[PDB]
Write a protein that binds this ligand. Structure first.
Ligand SMILES: N=C(N)c1cc(-c2ccccc2)c(-c2cn(CCN)cn2)s1
Ligand SMILES: N=C(N)c1cc(-c2ccccc2)c(-c2cn(CCN)cn2)s1
Ligand SMILES: [Ca+2]
Ligand SMILES: [Ca+2]
Ligand SMILES: [Ca+2]
Ligand SMILES: [Ca+2]
Ligand SMILES: [Cl-]
Ligand SMILES: [Cl-]
Lengths: 9, 235, 235, 9
């Protein structure tokens, strides 16, 4: 499972 | 550029409309046109730029991963299928590289050099790290090492400014640390560095939440949850 | 065309890869290239063509609807915002019309004229009705009536062939009747015709299900459920 | 609510 990066607002 | 005849304010207005219509390629073209007017970007405009290109490159990355997996299966008892899988993976890869080069070119000409406040400079240096990271995801040649080091260098400069100039709960600082931790885990083969950065970032943000309004608390804790989710996946 | 140098079989292979990667614009370009080789299309290839363009035009239609709603709100106590909403709605509309014209051009040059079997001819005439219907959704000028009649005429010819040559459960026949019923309700201001067609289609299919294998039963009943869902919305 | 048209397989 791939790491989570920053998400849009 | 094809947007050279359109007013800056109209480009920004149309970028917002394109977002509502989920037309992210259009949104990115409008924001590129706005950047090319040569004026600095406000906080809202910087986020419009990032949303647009993140959505465009995100679709390209998802497609590249599907195609790369098919290609890798084809290269194990697997029937030879000709050059088509490689060719089409290469086509998507080249498109993705072109989008990353476009964003990096906007940052280099001339968004970063004109960004003096921490919120703008950190934002742009983080973006530089992100788009080099996307290039690194597909890199294989005599450039993979240099692409990785370009991502690292941009993230490191952003980190150094963010730690001096921003509180530990600042959402840009948090998103930067989150993405640098992903760089360490997924690109740089440094899972321990990734874990350490995520933990320290989360803990230092936790200790600063008491200073925040309800709305800022919501913003910061949402990003902190991503740090926590990664730590759960990584440990 | 940019696909003129690629083998037919490679275009079909890449269309399938593009589908898996959710790259529907690429998928449509590959299938357009395959059609332009000049050979007839197999059943699988016809469905690849339809899937590709349905996804492309579907995104355009969704965006056009968002923008048209914003434009209509702006034209009610509403602050004047300049020409930008209209301009951008027009941009998306023109793109959508261009995709529809491309599909109609493939059908006219020369897919329909070479289609002699009911399964191919009905499929293409249905598609002709569908893409004229998408043109009608955005039409307003001295052409709206003629565009509507072009959709009607294509659907009617397809219906006449389908009723003579296909069983009432055939999935192409069902999908045609479904889409013609939508045409009646949403384009032609004929809700009673829409309801009558959906009801008769559903009932005649119900009575033919006993002739079908388990797998064909699943295919037909899935489309019948859409007829039922519309009847529930319309009554 | 808009009517449902034919869906892909
Ligand atoms: N049209 C969009 N998507 C966005 C608009 C804004 C926005 C920014 C400033 C003022 C008004 C709106 C966004 C924003 C803000 N921040 C802050 C960090 N949490 C992250 N994103 S995003
Ligand atoms: N690659 C895709 N999306 C599709 C492939 C096929 C397909 C067709 C023939 C043989 C093998 C696959 C599709 C199909 C079939 N029918 C029949 C009516 N229910 C509707 N669609 S769709
Ligand atoms: Ca400045
Ligand atoms: Ca500060
Ligand atoms: Ca023929
Ligand atoms: Ca027959
Ligand atoms: Cl290709
Ligand atoms: Cl426009």
């Amino acid at each position: 499972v791939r790491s989570l990066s920053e998400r849009l607002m | 550029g094809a947007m050279g005849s359109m007013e800056r304010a109209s480009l920004i207005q149309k970028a917002k409309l394109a977002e509502q219509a989920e037309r992210y390629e259009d949104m990115a073209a409008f924001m590129k046109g706005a950047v090319e007017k040569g004026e600095e970007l406000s906080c809202e405009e910087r986020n419009l730029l990032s949303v647009a290109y993140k959505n465009v490159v995100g679709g390209q990355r998802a497609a590249w991963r599907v195609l790369s997996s098919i290609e890798q299966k084809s290269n194990e008892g697997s029937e030879e299928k000709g050059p088509e899988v490689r060719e089409y993976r290469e086509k998507v890869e080249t498109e993705l590289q072109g989008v990353c080069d476009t964003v990096l070119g906007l940052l280099d000409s001339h968004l970063i050099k004109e960004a003096g406040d921490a919120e703008s400079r950190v934002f742009y240096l983080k973006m530089k790290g992100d788009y080099y990271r996307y290039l690194a995801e597909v890199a294989t040649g005599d450039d993979k090492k240099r692409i990785i080091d370009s991502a690292r260098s941009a993230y490191q400069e952003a980190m150094d400014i963010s730690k001096k100039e921003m509180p530990p709960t600042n959402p840009i600082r948090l998103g930067l640390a989150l993405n640098f931790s992903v760089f360490h885990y997924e690109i740089a083969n440094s899972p321990e560095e990734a874990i350490s950065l995520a933990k320290t970032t989360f803990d230092e943000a936790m200790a600063d939440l008491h200073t925040l309004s309800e709305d800022s608390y919501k913003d910061s804790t949402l990003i902190m949850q991503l740090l926590r989710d990664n730590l759960t996946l990584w440990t």
